[PDB]
Ligand binder design. Structure first.
Ligand SMILES: Nc1nc2c(ncn2[C@@H]2O[C@H](COP(=O)(O)OP(=O)(O)OP(=O)(O)O)[C@@H](O)[C@H]2OP(=O)(O)OC[C@H]2O[C@@H](n3cnc4c(N)ncnc43)[C@H](O)[C@@H]2O)c(=O)[nH]1
Ligand SMILES: Nc1nc2c(ncn2[C@@H]2O[C@H](COP(=O)(O)OP(=O)(O)OP(=O)(O)O)[C@@H](O)[C@H]2OP(=O)(O)OC[C@H]2O[C@@H](n3cnc4c(N)ncnc43)[C@H](O)[C@@H]2O)c(=O)[nH]1
Ligand SMILES: [Mn+2]
Ligand SMILES: [Mn+2]
Ligand SMILES: [Zn+2]
Ligand SMILES: [Zn+2]
Lengths: 340, 344
DNA sequence: ATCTGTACATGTACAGAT
DNA sequence: ATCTGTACATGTACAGAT
DNA sequence: ATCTGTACATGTACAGAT
DNA sequence: ATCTGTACATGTACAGAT
């Protein structure tokens, strides 16, 4: 049933190999150019993030997220109008440290370097306003897009917006939380305007995805398999499928599904609440949770509790009612959309 | 019953504070002296180990273990006659016998230095205990107002893969897991100057044992503020106390030490990995099953090093059958007569 | 003026004290 | 149940070195 | 400051056992 | 149909060399 769906979604070893080899070529070349050229980004380091590197990528290895992170000295942040997630930055050519001005130069560089690649078919997608990414389109023989995300790395204690965030205490525990919060935090040039950066915990999300159990042995070779990741895949696929069919759902993205499942994993911390034999119940309880988020217009950022991704501002009630009717439908008709 | 015993064993905060303040003073002073620009041990670093820093020290804060670890570059190791635990090693250049780095020569110089430095401390009453042959420690006796001993253990740090003797060691896969194991085995390993002759060093995983003690659960929340308390450490304390009590009364038990009880409990924690097999409401069963395990080790003359499987701490060399029979009858007795020795 | 090994500043888990 | 001392990990300030 | 080598976790593909 | 065991593939951390 849903086992058969996960079979469909499962990536092919062959395709992983071919995608990776090409992506790594282009990324390595870009990374060397930021260093080898005596550029503004000299110290930059590679941090692979998102679904491919979390092993929750579905259908195809056709989308990759890579952070080019740059350790900067001390930087006083100032919260930008109480959102919790957006800040200005303060204290070489990009002055306040402007996101746009810095992203632009980052982009100019990438575009130059891509233009001198004749070993593989790779263009740079037109820029999306207030996206932090520079997006590459590889044609390979098949379509693969890579988001290259500039990131400022800060070693200070995390912002206060995140104090009550990351509520993993009853699940992954207090030591894990304290350790995670000793890791640096990241700022990416996603604008809200043009000088605003945004907090990133892609590194933390990646740790969580690969260390998701209350038992240390969850999903290891001498432990028991859970169905936590499988539920994430199924949920993402339901959203992808709906999204490709209904333009009404443009406001929604997979980060919403990811955020909600982090909350469900917190609410139901036991590995035995995610037994593979109960995949149907688990997926269903996840759907029930997501619908409650829509109904109540409430889905708090997992790291920044005061930041509501389902506020009226970001997403219209109509959009939410629309998605609810569509989820309710698929749920009460045996998920016919999984058959396209 | 055993709850009341653990109450007795529990350290006083007041005593911890007074012990710690003095110990830290002496250790800091020693550590700074080793940094002397002309010291063979320049770049030595401090690593606190053993029961006090594992929170399984019982009765009093009267014994502390500290490693002074020194990173050395590449060093070929040669296993010393298939023991698994002992090896030869290959400015620092003044303790070398041809290719070989001498334990005793290096320990001696380490000791000469410590003794000098302690003799210039008039702040507090501290002497250096007579040397015990084939101990890696330089042992300080602080009189404070009360008796506290500190073992300062010289250690060579290597960052290479651990020795093969340890490949099948540390069988935590069903308990703490494969990631924890892989990570732990990326940590450096240590060599201390315990001889078996005079140039032989011995493997140390005191750092690893410390991690395990403080991260002892299958659940990440074991013993945390939003988790469930187990009785794993409490069992360790009770077992150590049974041995300490017997040891101080019967000279026949000189061959035995607390490392034996620690090693056995690591095995029990592996055999019974679930936190629910160490529920506080089952402290009696848990302690008893640990005793039953230890008795089987004695009767069959077998207690494998947890990190070095081929190294039997209860071989018929090292420990006489007599010693083992003697300890067995004593444990069996205490067990079947309500632990009267807990009342002394 | 610039760089740095040492010490301090900060934060929290663990466990004893209350 | 709440409060508090120690240990330990990480970040940063700076007198002494360069 | 950069690269390779090693080890093993997380995957997938497929056959034989259940 | 599902589980187990092996092979084959990629990602990632860290050490030692350069
Ligand atoms: N990562 C991330 N995404 C979002 C955040 N808020 C909103 N989003 C949007 O959700 C999707 C997620 O795409 P993805 O990151 O590739 O997702 P996964 O890899 O987990 O899963 P899969 O690829 O669906 O299988 C996307 O539409 C996001 O839109 P934008 O915000 O425009 O992101 C574009 C681009 O920028 C990256 N990015 C945005 N914000 C980021 C932060 N804070 N850190 C790191 N990268 C970030 C994004 O990865 C994408 O490449 C959100 O907070 N985080
Ligand atoms: N640590 C350790 N000890 C031993 C090993 N084999 C045998 N032993 C002997 O067991 C006891 C343990 O004393 P401890 O280290 O203080 O124990 P705890 O702190 O866990 O418990 P508590 O203090 O009883 O509450 C001791 O008699 C050991 O005797 P020796 O082997 O002669 O050493 C005495 C001295 O040397 C230290 N030491 C020995 N080997 C060491 C290694 N490999 N690393 C670090 N220190 C080592 C010992 O700590 C003590 O100070 C064994 O493998 N490990
Ligand atoms: Mn992605
Ligand atoms: Mn000790
Ligand atoms: Zn799992
Ligand atoms: Zn516990």
């Amino acid at each position: 049933k849903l086992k058969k769906v996960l079979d469909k979604l499962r990536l092919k070893r062959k395709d992983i190999s071919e995608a990776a080899e090409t992506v790594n070529k282009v990324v390595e070349r870009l990374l060397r150019r930021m260093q080898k050229r005596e550029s503004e980004f000299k110290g930059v380091e590679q941090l692979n993030t998102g679904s491919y590197y979390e092993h929750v990528k579905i259908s195809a290895p056709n989308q990759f997220n890579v952070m080019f992170k740059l350790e900067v000295p001390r930087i006083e942040l100032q919260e930008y109008y109480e959102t919790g997630a957006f800040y200005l930055v303060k204290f070489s050519h990009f002055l306040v440290l402007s996101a746009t001005k810095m992203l632009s130069k980052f982009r100019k560089i990438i575009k130059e370097e891509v233009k001198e690649i004749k070993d593989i078919d790779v263009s740079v997608e037109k820029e999306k306003p207030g996206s932090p990414a520079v997006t590459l389109l590889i044609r390979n023989p098949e379509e693969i897009s890579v988001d290259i995300i500039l990131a400022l790395e800060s070693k200070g204690s995390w912002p206060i917006s995140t104090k009550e965030g990351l509520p993993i205490q009853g699940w992954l525990g207090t030591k894990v939380r304290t350790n995670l919060r000793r890791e640096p935090f990241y700022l990416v040039p996603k604008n809200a305007q043009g000088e605003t950066w945004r907090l990133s915990f892609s590194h933390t999300e990646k740790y969580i995805l690969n260390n998701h159990g209350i038992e240390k042995t969850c999903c290891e070779s001498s432990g028991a398999k859970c169905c936590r990741k499988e539920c994430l895949k199924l949920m993402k696929y339901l959203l992808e499928q709906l999204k490709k069919e209904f333009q009404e759902l443009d406001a929604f993205c997979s980060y919403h599904v990811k955020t909600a499942i982090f909350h469900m994993w917190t609410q139901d911390p036991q590995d035995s609440q995610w037994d593979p034999r109960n995949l149907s119940s688990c997926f269903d309880k996840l759907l029930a949770f997501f619908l409650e988020c829509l109904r109540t217009e409430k889905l708090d950022h997992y790291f920044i509790p005061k930041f509501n991704l389902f506020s009226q501002e970001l997403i219209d009630r109509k959009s939410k009612e629309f998605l609810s009717k569509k989820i309710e439908y698929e749920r009460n008709n045996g998920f016919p959309i999984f058959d396209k």
